[model samples]
Target: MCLKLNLLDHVFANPFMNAAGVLCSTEEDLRCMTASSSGALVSKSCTSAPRDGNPEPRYMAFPLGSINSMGLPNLGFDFYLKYASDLHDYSKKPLFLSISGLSVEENVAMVRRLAPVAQEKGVLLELNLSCPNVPGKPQVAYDFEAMRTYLQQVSLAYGLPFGVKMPPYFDIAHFDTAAAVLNEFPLVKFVTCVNSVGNGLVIDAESESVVIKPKQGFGGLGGKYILPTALANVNAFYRRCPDKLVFGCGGVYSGEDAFLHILAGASMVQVGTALQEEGPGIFTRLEDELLEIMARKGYRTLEEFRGRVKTIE
Candidate 1:
């Protein structure tokens, strides 16, 4: 029998794990999150080559949250390969690489290059199919056919348990489309829901000036404000596909919030924007507080409460 609370352990035990994106942009940042965290460290989103990203004031604060147009800046795979092995040896954390590509062949080439490192280093791969910053192509994950073809190709090429990250769309109908894709690829281990919402902006009333020079006047939104929506989507997916694993993300700051996602049907929850406010201590705090909550609720394990929605007759 799998221990209910052992979920964290299971993830950490894996050679590759999800470390929130953007935040882990640097080697130091990656080290900090991995040392403090239990799971394998997922590197920040990388591209085929290095990018300077957007100009200054790339981030903005709104009433609900913040908008960012970081433009997917990264040291690229070459830089990652040069430093990644050394970093991995020092940290001793399984490194799950995150890469964003413009075309299917580019993405395939990326997988081919990184697959050996993943297998040899005991790491994993996460295909970032839904980055809002990339121009054109309707953001691959949003289009059903595009997403399906991409996943089918990558899964076959890598032969590794892979996952896709998606942006949160409000339409429930899209859930069916997403379910179909996941259902088609049994090798796709899980889905990480609700990447930042897009096209957000914040302006100063006094100066009447735009706070952030939005990428094409648009950016992705994330923070406390999106928690409810994130949970609702997680619940919706859980209801539609109970057996598939789901990783809940967005606005997860505390153990209660983490537990809420679990109850809503998430096997694990990713802490993104919340880490900025709570600091690295948040992970340890969550684990300790959750254990307390479990003790108080007479629940010894996560499975006891995970995905348990109450029904009315």
Candidate 2:
């Protein structure tokens, strides 16, 4: 029942943690996570300046899953930097700071400012290149050349190791090119796959209308609707980016989903829609469930089955 894992020379007690955006919007929310049983926690993906975000009804939950067009709302870069700088004083778990700048220059500037603090505090960074809800900003990771340029800029500006949070890619060609671009940067040490299925429209059958208010009811899809796709991206990058670690995200609600992500080649698994719905208590439940499964199967540690999925060949 040992779920501990070591990544980037740091050991995590377990693989379960919240995705970047959900349950991590404010300092109060983050403190709750620190008091919970999650192995780690991440702040909401932030911008250079504070944002009010999209209109009301931006997030909608469904029985099978959920959709959101939150548009990267946050308190701002300085707030998160100040919080992360002091996090380790009160919490022992790893803290990840996710940044989704409005432009390339903003991204570079934020990372540049954080580099010295990150090195001094042992805080990890996850650059968000794939937010689908911004009005006119296309996800940076979707464009190869632009993505390369962002990486190049950040690599030179930050001078410290970091990771990227990516959107899902359906086509194998996309996976190949995306992984290829990521492989070129040695400073990019980890990859978090599948930041919701972008631009998904959920309709109310009886109301005869769309669900969310942003972009004519279009939003990123999460929960059960995306588990398969999430696992695919996790494994795809896991195989291609041999030098980097993979963090699994999207549609992970239970221990079974977490187990599947690990089997598919993820060293750590992130919870999103489910966490928003269930609160931090879900971490303890997931840990109990995963341990039960492992004991039933005669396994002692996650390493016994992690990334061991079978294929026909």
Candidate 3:
């Protein structure tokens, strides 16, 4: 079974990698990923400076899924950039540097500093437009105009290809609008669909209290409970944006889920809740499981099944 995939002119040993924020916030965590079977890696979303994120009990795992209000906790941008530069110098595996600035100006500042370096290396930029956990900041991906402005400025500043991390959109009209806005910026090469379903409340019935402490127990949703919604978002953009690739995120705990993402048109599959729960070893397990699935289905390569999902007519 050939699970190798070609993305952005680079070959991946497989299509699995860590979602930006899960077990990818520091050098120790990143080293673990480097030694794992994941085909690529993405850093935690960084800002102009470091952040401590939300208080403890910020992340809670339940039977069905998990929830968290980890408000973009990460080291400053410079650390990830240096790590990316060093990795590119020594390895062929790709690195995606996720960035979520406090404002557009800050985003542009980071982009400006990264432009020349990213142009020469295997580092891919993932602008996080939907960080739902920030207390006062609104999600940029949710506002078409604001998102457009962001793309315009970043495109002009970077003058290079990049990707966006997006939030989930439930309505068909919203999918249409978002895809249209993305189409206007050819520099935007890929879209990572469905950052956790934002602002969800998880409660423990026995204790009669919210599970997490942030925002009165509100946080992003992840894991099995969101699988269907994640697939919908992946396919929606896959259908709408013919010129760009899609990266599938959310609710991917097993090989079947990863396979489903590929069939939905994702060039890459990212793990979050599962990676957080199972650790880096999960990548090897997922790869083996996915290969086994392909064998049973009589498929030999990813392209054979990629974007092959069917709808009842």
Candidate 4:
């Protein structure tokens, strides 16, 4: 008997949600999306306190992808607590709280304060270990030591299912370090591969100057441009650590893109840029398309071809 589980339904109804950190900064946006869908609602990345984020012109669009240096701006935890509870009640979407911190203590503090709510509401926690737009310092995801410490501390604090959002390191050598970090801690539930590629900039031919301005002068690259690289990373990780689950992001615009991620070894895929471009309807559209593909390919369920890739010696 093949049971079709609407993964999104399972997520929206119970303990998992979308990762909307800072992306869903406004209440209206949050309500609109959560009310329309079911699944865990992942909130914008918050800190112990609020941040204002970067100046205007924070976002720039290019042919391939969009770049932004939002700087993790938010209304802070105090405001979040007051509103988050309401958001949880109103939408009935399981909330997944994402927290960003520069120091171990800071991260711990945020978790400690929110731990009770998370437990009561059945919300999951996502640690944003990497943010490329921020100036100075290497992304936490790329640093094995920082990631390990962060995961260990948070896991100890909450004893809940937590995932890490990481950027794709270009070199394969770094995978060893990343795998080592995951192996050290079994509590880490899943890993989201390939946050936007860092420092991706598109120039304005008319202006001649850089499209966006920053001392670092680059933003994360996403969209179709990164599909191949994202898939390669997901496949490599699946090959190296078969036990770990992955949530593949980047360049997933349709059902075929979603299936590609599954074929490449992702347990699930996250759609952000595409949603922005195609609008919210893209989710249902892709879901339907994926089902059609599954049917045509004679796949009864995801298990049939999920991660079924051939390796050449």
Q: Per-candidate TM vs. native?
A: 0.87, 0.97, 0.97, 0.87
What is the TM-score (0 to 1) of candidate 1? Answer: 0.87
Evaluated at residue 215, the lDDT of candidate 4 is: 34
Query: How much is 111 displaced in model 2, in angstroms?
Result: 0.5
Better of 2 and 4 by lDDT: 2
Q: State the lDDT of candidate 4 residue by residue for 102-197, as single tens digits.
A: 677888888887778766666666678775323466777866776777888888886766677777877878887787777677766667776777
| lDDT tens readout by residue for model 3, 251-270 | 99999999999999988999
* Location of the lowest summed lDDT over 10 successive residues in candidate 1: 8-17
lDDT of 1 by residue, 1-313 (tens): 2223333223343111333564577777777767775444567777788887889778765545667787778878776665555566534445556777767777787887777766666555667877633466587878788888888888888776777777776887888778777778876776777678767666678988777774654677787778888888788777776556777877676778777888888776777666655567776777776777778888877778888967688
Q: Of the pair 3 and 4, which is ahead by lDDT? A: 3
Which residue pairs clash within candidate 3?
none
Give the higher-lDDT candidate: 1 or 4. Answer: 1
lDDT of each: 0.69, 0.90, 0.89, 0.67
Residue 266 lDDT (model 3) = 89
How far in Å is the alpha carbon of 62 misplaced in model 1?
5.9
Model 2 per-residue lDDT tens digits across residues 16-38: 88999998889899888878898
- Give stretches of model 3 more than 4 Å off: 87-92, 132-137
Model 2 CA deviation exceeding 4 Å by range: 87-91, 132-137
